[PDB]
Amino acid sequence: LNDPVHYDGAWHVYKYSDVKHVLMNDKIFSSNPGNRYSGISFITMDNPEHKEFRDISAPYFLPSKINDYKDFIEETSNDLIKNIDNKDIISEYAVRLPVNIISKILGIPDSDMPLFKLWSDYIIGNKRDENFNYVNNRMVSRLLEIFKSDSHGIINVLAGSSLKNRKLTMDEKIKYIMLLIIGGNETTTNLIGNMIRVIDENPDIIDDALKNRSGFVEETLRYYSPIQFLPHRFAAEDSYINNKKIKKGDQVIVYLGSANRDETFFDEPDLFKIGRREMHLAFGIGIHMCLGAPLARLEASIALNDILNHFKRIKIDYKKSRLLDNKMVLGYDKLFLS
């Protein structure tokens, strides 16, 4: 891999130790600009205000609390995989799974599920229409009603929340929920398609995958990282990487996929090996390390198990399947088997 280069108004950072240095130094490399370049809610906040925001939901994302959702995710995954044969695995299984799970965790009522899913599609970007304005207005309306009833989910927690000498705004509550929906959907959908791609490419991996689902999910994260780069870091003060001065104000783009293929940290980076020792950076690292990582881990793990037990043979049909076009992420636009 390359030392940091500057072009198109940003530094590009590729090496694993440099990606990590940047992400671990939140006070040197900030998460929001000096102004306007557009990330919502606490993802774009710096360390102090950010912790206040993240703590509101942090306890409910511990692998401990998340695990109470295991039977629900199994039930859901099974319902959708039952009868998927011959269909688009992305739109009929991989998109639908994370959106069901997240509505359960949020506390979206049963009777609001159809509209939540339409709104969710618009908002993560899976849909674009005239209907947007209408559907957003309809969903936000329901949202306000839910905030004032109660459940055990996040909506209810955001209702009873403040942090440090100040109540949460209603725009903050919506954006908070929006950040959960947007950061957990496409990424989980992309991972599911990327695990299917590993299987397609390494057909005798299957037995080992079954014996260590976690391990297989970890190596996919490393090897076909759903998120390829994070474009939004800005130097809060001058500092040096590989003897280059990164000046205050400079945008710093950090490449996770590329860092996850660094031969300095991974022996034989271009091979798929379950049970590697070093941590991958697919979920980032530091104070912004993925809030949904335990949930994502548990969803992928059940998805793998279910996909592996449903099909005998897994060949991707490349005359109908296509990779997404966006360079920032990695996944299938559509995926058809066999």
**Positions in the binding site for ligand HEM (CB under 6 A):** 42-43, 54, 179-180, 183-184, 187-188, 191, 226-227, 230, 282-284, 288, 290-292, 295-296
SS3 of 178, please?
Answer: helix
Q: How far is the CB of 130 from ligand HEM (least distance, A)?
A: 28
Q: How far is the CB of 82 from ligand HEM (least distance, A)?
A: 23
How would you classify the pairing of strands 10-13 and 251-255?
A: parallel
Q: Which one, 73 or 129, has the nearer CB to ligand HEM?
A: 73
Q: Which one, 295 or 318, has the nearer CB to ligand HEM?
A: 295
Q: How far is the CB of 79 from ligand HEM (least distance, A)?
A: 19
Q: Which one, 198 or 295, has the nearer CB to ligand HEM?
A: 295
Q: Which one, 29 or 311, has the nearer CB to ligand HEM?
A: 29
Which residue is at the shortest CB distance from ligand HEM?
292
**Cα separation of 310 and 307, whole Å?**
5
Whether residue 288 is annotated as binding a ligand: the answer is yes
Is the CB of residue 57 less than 8 Å from the CB of residue 176?
Answer: yes
Q: Which one, 4 or 184, has the nearer CB to ligand HEM?
A: 184
Residue 128 burial (C-beta neighbours within 10 Å; 0-12, 13-18, 19+): exposed
In this structure, which long-range contacts are made by residues 55-62, counting pairs with CB atoms below 8 Å and at least 24 apart in sequence?
55/163, 56/157, 56/158, 56/161, 56/163, 56/168, 56/176, 57/154, 57/157, 57/158, 57/176, 57/180, 57/291, 58/291, 60/105, 60/154, 60/157, 61/291, 61/292, 61/294, 61/295, 62/294
Letter for the amino acid at 257? G
Whether residue 12 is annotated as binding a ligand: the answer is no
The helix (H) or strand (E) run that includes residue 245 is strand 244-246
CA distances from 11 to 165, 174, 261, 266, 329 (A): 38, 33, 19, 24, 19
Whether residue 50 is annotated as binding a ligand: the answer is yes
H helices within the chain, ranges in order? Answer: 16-24, 47-61, 63-66, 70-81, 89, 96-106, 113-124, 131-148, 154-159, 170-201, 206-211, 213-223, 256-259, 293-310
* Tokens 């280069």 -> residue: 5
Q: How far is the CB of 265 from ligand HEM (least distance, A)?
A: 17
Q: Which one, 54 or 173, has the nearer CB to ligand HEM?
A: 54
Q: Which one, 80 or 230, has the nearer CB to ligand HEM?
A: 230
Q: How far is the CB of 256 from ligand HEM (least distance, A)?
A: 6
Q: How far is the CB of 284 from ligand HEM (least distance, A)?
A: 3
Q: How far is the CB of 86 from ligand HEM (least distance, A)?
A: 26
Enumerate the known binding-site residues for heme b: 50, 54, 233, 288, 290
Enumerate the known binding-site residues: 50, 54, 233, 288, 290
